[PDB]
Design a protein around this nucleic acid. Structure first.
Ligand SMILES: [Mg+2]
Ligand SMILES: [Zn+2]
Ligand SMILES: [Zn+2]
Lengths: 83, 99, 1335
RNA sequence: GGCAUAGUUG
DNA sequence: TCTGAATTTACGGGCGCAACTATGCCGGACG
DNA sequence: CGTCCGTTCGCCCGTAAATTCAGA
């Protein structure tokens, strides 16, 4: 569970970009295809995303890097699936 | 009193008022100011578009919540279209110019 | 979808373009069958199908015919949403004037033809004529006529000539006008004229004409020929119980217009007489004017038992229009409301939500989980399972509540802490359980309050509730730095009773090995809670590099203080709980915990404080009795003495020794003194009520009285209330406001008789009515503050400027009202703070002043710090983060995006309800310093000040200015400049009732340019023995010597004039009228001695006027330019004062009324912005003469005086940003190389960017002139017309925007709310930046 | 289900 | 006797938020 | 019953228009 998000705020020092990054990660985990990077403790996707933010293994840059790597993998796999 | 979804008014597709009518709480003007004082731009947007008077937006939001996906299509409130029609019903041509 | 909104006039071709069919019949429904008429208001061929994908006659009823049009009736079978958006039109038989452009004040048509509104109203409503095609006759064009004049013109000029009537005449005038030629003629008249009112009228007409030509509008479109009709789903008929219908007030005003139009059309076909058709046209005009804006013309038509019906304007304007009722604030789904209760067991981040409310609010989530777990394939089964409330839906509800916040909101959301996000805890009840600590933030007691719950649906909403709106994130108030979760009343009583001591208790003086042994002793009954013992305290100090360093000692404390020390976290010193711990002590304890340890330890500490305070307040059993309100034994004798004194004063009055007024004042003062003595006696008797000893001598101690403890701890009550509980409640005031001679000598422990209770009812009714009528004023003020400053958002990170305000402690004249530490706390410095020793940079230039910097400034005795302000920021469209400073909600700098305009407006307006509706005595030992002074010594050795605005400052030994005083012109100083003297004796002495004429040179007195009889007046005194020569004004003397002003000359023993020291002009003083001169002709004088004697707000409304920038009824006049001063013509209506500079524009002059008391003589060289008269200073003059920093300092000080008088702590950032929003426009004075007009008022940001980009090139920018507008005038004169329309005066704003063809980029916060997109402030700032970058 | 009126709650 | 400034006067704007209960009604008058 | 067409009486303020000074 979560009580305060001060650690997440100090790791992403804007208090507004934290909300957007956590929403992006939680939407990646909720639809989601992806799986949590932290041991889930019967927490919902937003809380898991914030707990990942606390550990410093997720931020905006890491999410963008992973998204572009996944886009490159999708481009490659479709390339060899057709031609 | 409490309400998830119920009836909506005719002129503006916003939830009814009161509890004798299964109505919704009025997130008034000062509550909008209070959300603006925070950084809650998405909470306010879902408050005044999806949860109040975006007919397609609210139907899609209900379907998404039942599907387990918490995400909203913003849309445009119907009361703004009503205001546009009422101002256009005077001798005043008001329009939303192209992007 | 779109990026801007365009508004303009609606051409009849455009109106026909909107329409999908003309409305011809004034019939809505058949009232027998519910089918719509053929071509009535509620139609089907015009507006669309009644039901989805079905024809009106029923020939087509399926989706296979999607798009076809029936032939029997002609209804395009499609959705009914088109019936919600299809518009129609009415073809008026006669042209009709649009009332909005006729009666807008100013009238657009009226000043488009420069014709007075009365004449155009006469011509429009068929009672006068106006001429078109005057030709070579005896008639002009705009000349109005009547029946007799028209008959004379027709019998005399029956040739080519056309005097028309009604709106046809006005339309002909509008169409037969060339806009460009009128612009040229008006411009040349404006350039070739000399009048001021003519220039104003001409420039208004030119502005209107140029705005008309600039846009695509045409003047003739202001006269309606095609009238649109609203879609029938926006003005519906709701069938009620019975065959009748609900009569909407829009189908009644369309019915009348259609009736009159059809009647006129059928009367024009049969060629009815002229009078009949004129009357019909007038009736049609009035019907249309009532439809568009009912009641603006007058005689508002009513339909249902004398009730003025709502027209289109009434539906788009007002408190119940579309902006303030359905767009700015809406009704929302997933919302509930219930009575709140306490639930003390809750943690600060959670609230108790009833099971049934949670089940009803989270129904879609429960449906989703039931379908996910396979318990209901369809949604109907899930709905049935939930409405039966089976045993499995509760587990689903419990697992969807898990970490889903809910927004709790109380009804008057005064500030942003009025809505907070909590985690639900399912409660077997029907009432919400609200955490006790958040009650102060909500201003919520539990006497029957109700709160509303809202469910954040989407993931972004949930994360905003958790990361922004959580109750554990809102520790500090956003209005100041103080915490907002301070324990209120029971926690402070428990902590006060626990942390206390008595002279002798159980286990006094025993030695304890730690707090655990203290708790084990108290809980077992072996020691009292408050017993003085020595304990071993191991406190941790983190003065190292973030490392906790242990320190163990033997503290002499009490058992309760150790038990509380078991709660305090590791980083705090033990001295924080070694006191009595009232309310302020707990507040500062939480503040220090937040400042040292952070957020999470502070939240845990607050929860633990609340728990232990409730526990030990219950353990105390602190009750209230009838014997706890101890009545002093000396009250009776004090009242007897006061009654004897009033009896003796009555005896002294009835004998004629004193008058009525002084007797009243004496009685009031002696009763006040008696009341003060009674209050002092009762307070002493309650403070030392306990005298306890059993081991020797009696010892005084602070009383354990219940009432006294509840008052002293700060829990509840105060000195005034406890005073009425025991002592006399004192003087009462009549409803007229005057104090009553006889007070209420009875408290509430004793019984008030009938008269005293009746007077108290006077007082209480006045207060209740004032509160009721003051809440509305506070709400209006805060709404105006929000509207003026809502688009102001922190956009940049550092504007990179070196301008700021010089913050100094504010001194009223005595002790310092506010120190410098709280005025520069958390604000970025502007310059380098040089050390008070010698030119050493103490702190860097752009460092945020947190507590460490503030305290090290305090220890170095820094008195003036130049700091960066919002008003002095060079950021276009916003404010940089460094000019604002600390967030005041967190301890860091303000984030890029955070909306500070709304926060400022809420912070200023929230405490609105709390607000109501000779000699210098130096007190401290320090130096004496005079500033803005030019003094001179007399023969007696006493200095006299020859300056005007000299400030006398008592300085301490450290250099800090401790005391401030104002020295009038001609005050006697027994001391010198810069010489340290003793505090306690008066240093400056003068007489306020007499203005001196003190000299600057010595010699003999000569009254030159004086003739006895008319220039002066003789007074032969009989009670003194000395004569008098008094110089009078121009209106009181004789008509003999009023054209020459007498002068006073100081000469030598020979007669030659003495020159002014410094200049070549002899020292002559122009003596004004009404001067009491004791001296005669030929009297020896010296330097520094008098020559003659020259004789002589609110609370919340004061703040409202300061923010609205009202010019006071007695404005203090200032000086526009420097130089010498003189007088002019002898009262040309009033007295003319001419200020001639040394080398500037000599012909500057002003007209001053002669009745007001002037201040400057003819022998003072002043600068710009110096006082010439006295009284309140108009803020516009301060802005235009001293600058922007002067006016912002004035406004912030003048509002902070009110807020400090009423005990309100508001930071100055909010007032500074409101002031910044006040001065946002500017008037051009020099056109320069830009495209602006000569003296048109443009926004400051636009002229700033224009001349900034011009400065980059080889041209020269345009010089501007800043303006100060009130909050409502500034919020109505905004470049975005939607904000102004949603604010006051929707009709006028919309009329102006339509006529000028204004375009709104919706770049603020209110526009995006109305449109329904992301606010460009919080999480939406990134989205708006992304859409700007990817435009 | 819209307005008005009257009363009430904080 | 004309003409501009200042004064006075008439008039249109505004006057807190949220919530609950009840009745009356939507029009009074010819075939 | 079925149908069917016409009440002045508060407080405050800003602003434009009417009125009155005050000349040359
Ligand atoms: Mg209450
Ligand atoms: Zn058909
Ligand atoms: Zn700045």
């Amino acid at each position: 569970a979560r009580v305060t998000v001060q650690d997440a705020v100090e790791k992403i020092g804007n208090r507004f970009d934290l909300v957007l990054v956590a929403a992006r990660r939680a939407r990646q985990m909720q639809v989601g295809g992806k799986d949590p990077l932290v041991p889930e403790e019967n927490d919902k996707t937003t809380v898991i995303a914030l707990r990942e933010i606390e550990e410093g293994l997720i931020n905006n840059q890491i999410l963008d890097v992973r998204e572009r790597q996944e886009q490159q993998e999708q481009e490659a796999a479709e390339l060899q699936a057709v031609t | 009193h409490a309400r998830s979804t119920g009836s909506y008014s005719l002129v503006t597709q916003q939830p009814l008022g009161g509890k004798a009518q299964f109505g919704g709480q009025r997130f008034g003007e000062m509550e909008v100011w209070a959300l603006e004082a925070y950084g809650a731009a998405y909470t306010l947007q879902e408050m005044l578009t999806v949860k109040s008077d975006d007919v397609n937006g609210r139907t899609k939001m209900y379907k998404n919540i039942v599907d387990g996906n918490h995400q909203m299509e913003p849309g445009m409130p119907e009361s703004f279209n009503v205001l546009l029609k009422e101002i256009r019903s005077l001798g005043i041509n008001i329009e939303l110019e192209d992007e | 979808e779109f990026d801007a909104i365009k508004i303009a006039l609606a051409s009849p071709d455009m109106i026909r373009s909107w329409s999908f069919g003309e409305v011809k019949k004034p019939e809505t429904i058949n009232y027998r069958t519910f089918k719509p008429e053929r071509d009535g208001l509620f139609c089907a061929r015009i507006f669309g199908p009644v039901k989805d994908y079905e024809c009106l006659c029923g020939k087509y009823k399926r989706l296979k015919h999607r798009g076809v049009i029936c032939e029997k009736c002609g209804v395009e079978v499609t959705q009914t949403k088109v019936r919600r958006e299809r518009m129609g039109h009415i073809e008026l038989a006669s042209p009709t004037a649009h009332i909005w452009f006729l009666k807008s004040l100013p009238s657009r048509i009226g000043l488009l033809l420069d014709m007075p509104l009365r004449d155009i109203e006469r011509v429009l409503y068929f009672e006068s004529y106006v001429v078109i095609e005057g030709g070579m006759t005896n008639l002009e064009r705009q000349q109005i006529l009547t029946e007799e004049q028209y008959l004379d013109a027709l019998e005399e000029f029956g040739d080519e000539f056309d005097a028309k009537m009604g709106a046809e005449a006005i339309q002909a005038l509008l169409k037969s006008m060339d806009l460009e030629q009128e612009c040229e003629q008006l411009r040349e008249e404006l350039n070739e004229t000399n009048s001021e009112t003519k220039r104003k009228k001409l420039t208004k007409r030119i502005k209107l004409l140029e705005a008309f030509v600039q846009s695509g509008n045409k003047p003739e479109w202001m006269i309606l020929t095609v009238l649109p009709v609203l879609p029938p789903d926006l003005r519906p008929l709701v069938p009620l119980d019975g065959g009748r219908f609900a009569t909407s007030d829009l189908n009644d005003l369309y019915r009348r217009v259609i009736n009159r139009n059809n009647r006129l059309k059928r009367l024009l076909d049969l060629a009815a007489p002229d009078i009949i058709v004129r009357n019909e046209k007038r009736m049609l005009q009035e019907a249309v004017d009532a439809l568009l804006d009912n009641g603006r013309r007058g005689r508002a038509i009513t339909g249902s038992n004398k009730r003025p019906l709502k027209s289109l304007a009434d539906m788009i304007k007002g408190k119940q229009g579309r902006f303030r009722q359905n767009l700015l604030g809406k009704r929302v789904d997933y919302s509930g409301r219930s009575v709140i209760t306490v639930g003390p067991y809750l943690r600060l981040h959670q609230c108790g939500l009833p099971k049934k409310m949670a089940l009803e609010l989270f129904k879609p989530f429960i449906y989703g989980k039931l379908e996910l777990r396979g318990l209901a394939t369809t949604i109907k089964a899930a709905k049935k399972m939930v409405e039966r409330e089976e045993a499995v839906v509760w587990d689903i509800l419990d697992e969807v509540i898990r970490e889903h916040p809910v927004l709790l909101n109380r009804a008057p959301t005064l500030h942003r802490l009025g809505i907070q996000a909590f985690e639900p805890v399912l409660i077997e009840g029907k009432a919400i359980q609200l955490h006790p600590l958040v009650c102060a933030a909500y201003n919520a007691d539990f006497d029957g309050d109700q709160m509303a719950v809202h469910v954040p649906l989407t993931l972004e909403a949930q994360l905003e509730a958790r990361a922004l709106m959580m109750s554990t994130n809102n520790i500090l108030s956003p209005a100041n730095g103080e915490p907002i979760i301070v324990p209120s009343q029971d926690v402070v009583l428990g902590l006060y009773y626990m942390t206390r001591d008595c002279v002798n208790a159980k286990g006094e003086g025993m030695v304890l090995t730690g707090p655990k042994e203290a708790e084990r002793l108290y809980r077992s009954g072996l020691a009292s809670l408050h017993a003085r013992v020595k304990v071993r305290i191991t406190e941790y100090e983190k003065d190292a590099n973030g490392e906790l360093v242990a320190k163990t000692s033997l503290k002499d404390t009490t058992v309760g203080r150790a038990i509380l020390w078991m709660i305090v976290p590791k980083g705090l010193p033990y001295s924080i709980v070694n006191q009595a711990l009232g309310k302020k002590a707990i507040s500062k304890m939480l503040n220090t915990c937040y400042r040292i340890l952070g957020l999470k330890p502070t939240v845990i500490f607050a929860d633990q404080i609340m728990y232990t305070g409730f526990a030990y307040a219950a353990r105390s059993g602190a009750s209230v009795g009838i014997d706890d309100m101890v009545i002093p034994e000396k009250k009776h004798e004090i009242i007897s003495e006061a009654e004897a004194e009033v009896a003796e004063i009555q005896e002294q009055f009835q004998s004629g020794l004193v008058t009525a007024g002084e007797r009243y004042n004496k009685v009031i003062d002696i009763w006040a003194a008696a009341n003060d003595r009674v209050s002092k006696a009762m307070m002493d008797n309650l403070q030392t009520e306990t005298v306890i000893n059993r081991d020797g001598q009696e010892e005084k101690q602070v009383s354990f009285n219940s009432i006294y403890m509840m008052a002293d701890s700060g829990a509840r009550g105060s000195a005034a209330q406890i005073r009425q509980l025991a002592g006399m409640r004192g003087l009462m005031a009549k409803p007229d406001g005057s104090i009553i001679e006889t007070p209420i000598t009875a408290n509430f422990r004793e019984g008030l008789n009938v008269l005293q209770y009746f007077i108290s009812t006077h007082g209480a009714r006045k207060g209740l009515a004032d509160t009721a009528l003051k809440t509305a004023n506070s709400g209006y003020l805060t709404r105006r503050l929000v509207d003026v400053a809502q688009d102001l958002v922190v956009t940049e990170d550092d504007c990179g400027t070196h301008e700021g305000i010089m913050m100094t402690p504010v001194i009223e004249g005595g002790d310092v009202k506010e120190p410098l530490r709280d005025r520069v706390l958390g604000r970025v410095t502007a310059e380098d703070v040089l050390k008070p020793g010698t030119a050493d940079i103490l702190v860097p230039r752009n460092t945020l002043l947190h507590e460490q910097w503030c305290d090290l400034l305090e220890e170095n005795s820094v008195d003036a710090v130049k700091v960066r302000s919002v008003v002095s920021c060079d950021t276009d469209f916003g404010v940089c983060a460094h000019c604002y400073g600390r967030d005041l909600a967190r301890g860091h700098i303000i984030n890029k995006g955070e909306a500070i305009g709304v926060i400022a407006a809420q912070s200023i307006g929230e405490p609105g309800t709390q607000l109501t509706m000779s000699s210098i005595q130096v007190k401290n030992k320090g130096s004496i310093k005079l500033s803005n002074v030019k003094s001179v010594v007399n023969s007696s050795g006493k200095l006299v000040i020859t300056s005007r605005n000299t400030e006398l400052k008592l300085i301490d030994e450290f250099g800090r200015t401790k005391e401030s005083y104002k020295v009038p012109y001609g005050a006697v100083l027994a001391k010198g400049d810069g010489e340290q003297v003793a505090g306690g004796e008066t240093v400056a002495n003068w007489d306020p009732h007499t203005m001196p004429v003190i000299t600057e040179v010595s010699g003999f007195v000569r009254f030159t340019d004086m003739i006895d009889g008319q220039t002066i007046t003789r007074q032969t005194d009989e009670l003194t023995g000395l004569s008098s020569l008094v110089v009078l004004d121009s209106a009181e003397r004789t008509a003999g010597g009023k054209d020459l002003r007498p002068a006073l000359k100081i000469v030598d023993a020979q007669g030659n004039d003495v020159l002014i020291p410094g200049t070549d002009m002899p020292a002559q003083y122009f003596l004004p009228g009404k001067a009491i001169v004791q001296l005669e002709d030929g009297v020896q004088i010296s330097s520094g001695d008098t020559l003659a004697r020259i004789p002589q707000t609110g609370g919340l409304p004061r703040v409202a006027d300061l923010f609205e920038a009202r010019r006071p009824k007695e404005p203090a006049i200032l000086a526009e330019i420097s130089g010498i001063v003189s007088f002019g013509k002898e009262t040309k209506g009033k007295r003319r004062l001419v200020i001639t500079p040394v080398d500037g524009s000599d012909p500057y002059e002003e007209m001053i009324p002669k009745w007001r008391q002037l201040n400057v003589f003819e022998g003072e060289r002043v600068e710009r912005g110096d006082v010439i008269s006295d009284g309140p200073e108009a803020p516009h003059d301060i802005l235009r003469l001293r600058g922007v920093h002067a006016v912002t300092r004035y406004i912030v000080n003048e509002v902070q005086d009110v807020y400090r008088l009423q005990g309100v702590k508001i930071n100055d950032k909010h007032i500074e940003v409101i002031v910044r929003q006040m001065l946002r426009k500017a008037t051009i004075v020099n056109a320069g190389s830009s495209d602006f007009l000569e003296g048109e008022q443009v926004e400051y940001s636009r002229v700033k960017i224009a001349n900034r980009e011009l400065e980059a090139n080889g041209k020269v920018g345009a010089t501007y002139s800043r303006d100060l507008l009130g909050i409502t005038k500034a919020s109505l004169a905004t470049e975005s017309f939607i904000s102004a329309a949603s604010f006051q005066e929707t009709t006028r704003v919309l009329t102006e925007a339509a006529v000028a063809g204004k375009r709104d980029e919706l770049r603020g916060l209110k526009e995006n709310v109305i449109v329904g997109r992301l606010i460009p402030a919080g999480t939406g700032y990134a989205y708006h930046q992304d859409r700007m970058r990817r435009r």
